[PDB]
Design a protein around this ligand. Structure first.
Ligand SMILES: CCCCCCCCCCCCCC(=O)O
Ligand SMILES: CCCCCCCCCCCCCC(=O)O
Ligand SMILES: CCCCCCCCCCCCCC(=O)O
Ligand SMILES: CCCCCCCCCCCCCC(=O)O
Lengths: 278, 240, 242, 52, 278, 193, 240, 52, 240
């Protein structure tokens, strides 16, 4: 049926890399492809065929593993809240900045528009952190800014009449759910050269764009936990638009909410004793 | 026939250079006004025209032997200047592009190379989160302390991904960049957010054919382009 | 109910799964997409942009100066300016460039690379330079006589400030390994050598700077690609960021 | 696709209501490298001298 | 096939918000859109374009998250009966008034016609309420008014020949089932200005509309429980018709079966010291 | 339209919180009212129909209108300035500063009521309803509404020297909400019995 | 041309006002008879016509300085009045709409504002569940004790969602509301259930150009509209 | 719907017999705001004076 | 149908009045932009649009028993206000018309009449040539000392030749005048020359139905209309 045709999108990865045309020797004063001028800011236009004698090469290699979708389109850890047994409650602030691998991958772009698939793995363990048996339901509640936060395991906030929740078992399959692009802005921002507030220039609000922050995930067990639970929160970025590539992060990350780095030794690649030998 | 000779006429103002390289147009995107499909603010914008879309010259900088570089936030650097500055002060939100022209002449008896970066959303840090006098330095601009890290934990070497030109003294005395508006929203406040940073970083140091080092200034000239303003109220000068 | 047989792989979570999954906010209607300049659809658009090699990686050089290879007036003929093992992996100068940092995220590479050099001496400073690419099998070329036997360009300093040496894809196989993993003998994928030589000399008028610089720049050609994502070696953490 | 060479051909079937539920997009989209490599007002053809 | 076409309904959320037309200045005595009269009971008709000079804005925002279906169309807690080990039996009286979030959401309307999806999560715990292991079937029996109630875990009422029952496992997936609009009336009533009975005006039967009450859910374990079981009963309202919007509840709820409130301090929003400063 | 709980001064209880005082002034250009434009928080807009709906949502967009009704005697005259100041600074301090913004000027007469349309003036397509501090949702500051005497309230001898404005608020047809969220002030400590 | 002048003629009765605002027609729905598709009761209804569809005037109320407000249940308030009252007493079930007219004149030397609410299904409470003398107060009506909470834990400010008018003494002396039948069933008992509540609440207090406070009454006039009755038996007056 | 903008387009497929089993309805239904905002016998056009 | 009710919308600003007389359009000439045939200055004008073409309210004046009158020079009075003020400061020459609205309400228990003159080229004198504080009094305006002679050796009685309205308190509470640009040249400096004077002169004194005299302010609201500016330089505020 055509109605089911609406739920199917045929999508194709068949873009190839550029090929090579055979070329011959050139002795002239007409064509000088090797002479360049980096001052313009343009990258060199010279190609293989104009610099040496080439054979013909039919293109066969795909480019799809470096499409922005493929590069971001896998799951990565973004949150690891620990539910202790004293209160049986925990939360994770929602952003991709606690764990460095996804953050550094995002640092190649300025603005990014995407959806998210979240995946939550819960693991129970003892005080000495050895795996242990515990079968219990847990509740993950999305708490958006301005909604009252639960303060206990039995708080009546966990009613969840308006906050969305997911209920799953600690020893069941992983909870998984998708999320549309939720920013009030038309993209997310990986970096922000401004202040979070008018009438304020506190350093702690520099580089803080609050339209990236959609709130909190809160976690309880539905009864009081017998053992601590660790939730691992994975995000896969999908349906991805990217704008304005950047110099990628090179210094290690130090803080969650700013770009501070050490910068004690100004170098990235390793040293050698002489430029004319390895 | 000659991309070494240029003339830039905006408003009542005209720049010339006899040693340009070319003109960099960032992302191949000439500045353009906001279309009805992307716009959100319902009030009718003020478009000041030539009163603001004109070249403004900042104070010059001496290129010294030890210079690490200089930077300016936009619109920050022009927020107190002319009718651009006044339109930016009197409105809540602003949008527009830039025409940037960096001047530095020296002799055929000099050597040295400047890198001229226009960096969008150039959030900066060092070993510490920066204060307001560095995030929004005004018309006088700021200076780099970690030019190798591009003040941001990235690297200067990879900043050629950003729109740029060089000033290599053997070749040219000026760099020109045309910048479109870049943001994740249609308009944004001029006092709270800097959409672009103009960064001028020495890569090859300045050397003279004698040991006596005359004064070689760097001079920045910036024209706003295709500007709109919405949200008229009293004039507010800074985010402090 | 429809009879079924769940098989192996039931209830597993694979990080590269391509599956639809229920939306926790099925009534949400996002903000429109607006025009933004510089949309990127494929990271090989970035890899084709030139970036500066951290080429002056000599012990003791710090900061911006690591980006300028010294070039001097020579007192002897046919001297060497620079030497560089052609490698997208490892930790040498190519590893910190745009192409090198992308290669840190990938396991395999193919295609031609180009190196653009810009001279920074005074207008009055002259010189000719030989830039050589030696296919693998042996060592770095020891003298300009040996290096010239390979692919090479000869650069005349002049009004056009810059030159390109195109390092063409010359290879037994369709792809090479990015890394030089020793236990796995990925030196099998050795990709050759780049060396720079004085073709004549750097010559100056009396009392000019007797030392100038080359800024080396590198980028991928349009015939280039990467395979197999992999973790970046030098982007680590010992603790959760707070 | 039971295989052409480097052509992955996929029928993305979304079972849920919201487009955000769909799996990741496998299309190759247009590449315009020249907005980043040749970002200059005057085109410089390969065989010409760049300056002047 | 067309027969399977009967089981598919293509349904679309593409209603947009109103746009904006550009306007210019007006100097006249003809058109006075800003002059109003609130005495009529009509809301102001003045629009943006007639009050200031506007630009043109193409509408892009949807309205679907405030459709009555979307606003009610999620699950909320409505019942939390506890099955003790002494009798292994419990029940929940069926109405959406024990837990305040759903009740307050319903208080925006007078009459509501809907279906219900019920979801039941069972959790076992110790006397000190710590999660514990217990695998057992439980039985939820719908007991409508006039059907005899079970008095024990082994009562022969649990035969369930005519009452519908659901059997599920305490440590299995949650039981879930749908329910059509069951009122004898043509809608449910959120508020009732009348008496439950003729020939009676007892205050305890004021505001009681017994056509909202469809009876009881009764709960046992199929054997005698070793640990207490807590059932959490969630309801999602769907296929929703709503009539006659109301002033929503503002004072906290106090009782299950009437609108009594404290009303000690007559205010809702917070105070300030002066009307001309914040 | 619904009535703003606009007279939220400490000590005013009950129905009187719905009438902003307006008096005969002995000085020129005085201020009648000041209000931070906010759908969230706990100020006067939060208890209205629009404000109580906003309690269930996280984000908002669109134009809002405020309709004011004067309640003085037939013989009581006056002119009032109603101002909307886009964000970036503080509340306007005097009528000279407030008039620089969007504003209407209200003449008391037969048509009892006026509308100040607060138009959607915004860097982004949507704002955050809440003012969540830890998350810096003050980023979404939406400006100011102030009311001023444009001339004065004038009365015949021995009339009431104080009258009232009843403020009313509603959304325009270009308005919407996103992201359901729990209502802050609808709580319980126990199951209802 | 003038919505300040109105005339309402039902039966043998006619109202006029020279200061109306307009006429509120609740939910834009004029009262209408029950269609065969929604009806359930199989007996043929009695439709009394003009004998009951006519204006009835209740006793007037003094507007005092301290007045919190007044309220009447419908049909409750008219259940002992005229042939409406008799038809409602003699039948088990009843349906119909209302034409409500609130009168209050004062001078151009007075100020004050009444809110005139028609509230459907107005179930009331306070700190306690109310007794019969408040839930069904009869022709004399009841008084508010929590006018801020609208006797029901909601708020007076948000009750403009209900059909309403104002009586603002500078503008008008009368409010008119036309109410359709509202219920979740087709017909319902007149003695057991009140479909509408007429509520008149002072918002701006009553002030006079002197300190001597003459008598200013409020007067309610209500006409049933499009009435039907089914289930004829003996006459039953109240649910007690 | 593999995407138009703010158009969610859903094929609700009910697997059970009773219509009550079906998932929630995603249609946008007609809005008549004027039964609540303009509930008056005589229409008052925006440009007119309301009273008289 | 009613020239007693008016609404004036310019920019983000809207005025209303329920007691207007009509609108005076001086010499029947709506403000209009300068045509290429009459223009002399060759640079492209800045037209700020809504940023300046909007109503500005000056500080109010008390109408006292002894008041002789008040006056404001234009553009003088608005030269330090808003984006009009800034565009006038930053340009050598300016042209444009005005929308003037004078407000003064009182009671049906008051009497008194204001004359509202817009006087073009109103050069003033008395027994002495006036100082700068009277020729260009700014936003606060000046006061008459010879209201009978119209400060200029002419007569107030004959000033009805100028565009005018009355505010007669028994009739209206507001006067509206639309003024075209008037000059003998196409454009002229805003700081050196005043093209119009707004003059408000009491003719019948202000009388109250008691001896206790409450405060009756006069309030001026002025919108520039169809403005152009040429000759961009630094901002210059006054001719001193
Ligand atoms: C739990 C359902 C709603 C949660 C919304 C999650 C959306 C996450 C997007 C994060 C984008 C910003 C990333 C960052 O700031 O580093
Ligand atoms: C339950 C309905 C069954 C429909 C699923 C049919 C199989 C999925 C289509 C996969 C299309 C791409 C596969 C491929 O050719 O590589
Ligand atoms: C267990 C199967 C039959 C149960 C029927 C449940 C239907 C519940 C509808 C409740 C509607 C009234 C809500 C209320 O009174 O507050
Ligand atoms: C087992 C029979 C398979 C039929 C299900 C096909 C997929 C469900 C249709 C979903 C339609 C809406 C999806 C969308 O376009 O957003």
């Amino acid at each position: 049926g055509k109605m089911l045709k609406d739920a199917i999108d045929k999508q194709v990865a068949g873009a190839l890399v550029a090929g090579t045309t055979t070329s011959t020797h050139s002795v002239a004063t007409d064509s000088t492809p090797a002479l360049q001028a980096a001052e313009t800011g343009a990258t060199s236009t010279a190609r293989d065929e104009s610099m040496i004698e080439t054979r013909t090469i039919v293109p066969t290699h795909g480019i799809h593993e470096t499409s922005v979708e493929s590069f971001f389109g896998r799951s990565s850890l973004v949150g690891m809240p620990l539910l202790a047994t004293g209160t049986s409650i925990t939360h994770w602030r929602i952003d991709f900045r606690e764990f460095v691998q996804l953050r550094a991958k995002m640092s190649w772009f300025t603005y990014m528009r995407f959806d998210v698939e979240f995946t939550i793995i819960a693991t129970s363990s003892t005080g000495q952190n050895v795996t242990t048996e515990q079968h219990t339901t847990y509740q993950v509640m999305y708490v958006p800014p301005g909604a009252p936060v639960p303060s206990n395991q039995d708080s009546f906030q966990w009613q969840s009449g308006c906050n969305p929740s997911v209920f799953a078992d600690t020893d069941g399959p992983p909870a998984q759910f998708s999320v549309p692009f939720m920013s009030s802005a038309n993209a997310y921002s990986t970096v922000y050269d401004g202040y979070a507030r008018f009438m304020d220039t506190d350093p702690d609000r520099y580089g803080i764009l609050p339209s990236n922050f959609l709130g909190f995930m809160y976690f309880r067990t539905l009864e009081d936990a017998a053992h601590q639970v660790r939730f691992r929160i994975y995000a896969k970025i999908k349906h991805t638009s990217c704008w304005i590539p950047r110099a990628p992060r090179q210094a290690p990350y130090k803080k969650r909410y700013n770009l501070v780095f050490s910068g004690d030794s100004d170098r990235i690649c390793s040293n050698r004793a002489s430029l004319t030998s390895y | 026939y000659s991309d070494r000779v240029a003339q830039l006429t905006l408003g009542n103002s005209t720049i010339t250079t006899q040693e340009a390289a070319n003109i960099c147009v960032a992302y191949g995107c000439w500045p353009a006004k906001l279309s009805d499909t992307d716009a959100t603010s319902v009030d009718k914008p003020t478009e000041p025209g030539v009163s603001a879309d004109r070249f403004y010259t900042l104070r010059s900088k001496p290129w010294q032997a030890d210079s690490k570089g200089w930077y300016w936030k936009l619109p920050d650097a022009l927020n107190n200047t002319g009718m651009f500055g006044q339109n930016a002060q009197f409105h809540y939100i602003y949008r527009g592009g830039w025409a940037v022209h960096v001047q530095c002449n020296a002799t055929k008896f000099h050597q040295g190379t400047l890198l001229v970066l226009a960096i969008p959303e150039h959030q900066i840090a060092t070993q510490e989160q920066p204060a307001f006098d560095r995030t929004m330095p005004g018309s006088e601009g700021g200076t780099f302390q970690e030019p190798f890290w591009l003040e941001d934990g990235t690297s200067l070497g990879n900043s050629l991904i950003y729109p740029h030109q060089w000033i290599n003294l053997r070749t040219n005395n000026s760099a020109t960049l045309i910048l479109p508006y870049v943001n994740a929203i249609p308009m944004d406040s001029a006092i709270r957010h800097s959409n672009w940073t103009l960064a001028i970083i020495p890569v090859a140091p300045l050397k003279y054919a004698a040991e006596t080092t005359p004064l070689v200034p760097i001079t920045v000239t910036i024209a706003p382009m295709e500007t709109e303003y919405n949200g008229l109220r009293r004039a507010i000068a800074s985010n402090q | 109910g429809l009879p079924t047989k769940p098989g192996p792989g039931s209830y597993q979570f694979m990080t590269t799964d391509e599956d639809c999954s229920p939306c926790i906010l099925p009534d949400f209607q996002p903000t429109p997409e607006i025009f933004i300049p510089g949309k990127v659809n494929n990271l090989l658009e970035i890899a084709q942009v030139e970036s500066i090699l951290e080429a002056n990686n000599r012990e003791g050089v710090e900061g911006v100066e690591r980006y300028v290879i010294p070039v001097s007036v020579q007192d002897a003929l046919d001297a060497q300016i620079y030497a560089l093992r052609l490698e997208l992996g490892g930790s040498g100068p190519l590893s910190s460039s745009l192409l090198g940092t992308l290669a840190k995220h990938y396991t395999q590479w193919s295609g031609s690379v180009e190196i653009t050099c810009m001279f920074t001496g005074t207008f009055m400073t002259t010189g000719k330079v030989l830039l050589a690419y030696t296919p693998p099998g042996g060592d770095m070329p020891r003298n300009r006589e040996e290096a010239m036997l390979g692919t090479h360009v000869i650069w005349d300093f002049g009004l056009q400030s810059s030159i390109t040496l195109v390092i063409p894809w010359i290879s037994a196989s369709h792809f090479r390994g990015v890394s030089n993993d020793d236990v796995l003998n990925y030196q099998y994928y050795a990709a050759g050598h780049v060396t720079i030589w004085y073709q004549t000399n750097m010559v100056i008028p009396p009392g000019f700077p007797n030392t100038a610089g080359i800024i080396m720049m590198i980028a991928a050609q349009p015939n280039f690609s990467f395979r197999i994502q992999k973790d970046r070696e030098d982007m680590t953490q010992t603790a959760i960021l707070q | 696709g039971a295989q052409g060479g480097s052509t992955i051909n996929y029928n993305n079937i979304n079972y849920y209501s919201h487009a955000a539920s769909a799996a990741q997009n496998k299309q190759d989209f247009t590449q315009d490298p020249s907005k980043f490599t040749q970002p200059i007002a005057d085109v410089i053809k390969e065989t010409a001298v760049p300056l002047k």
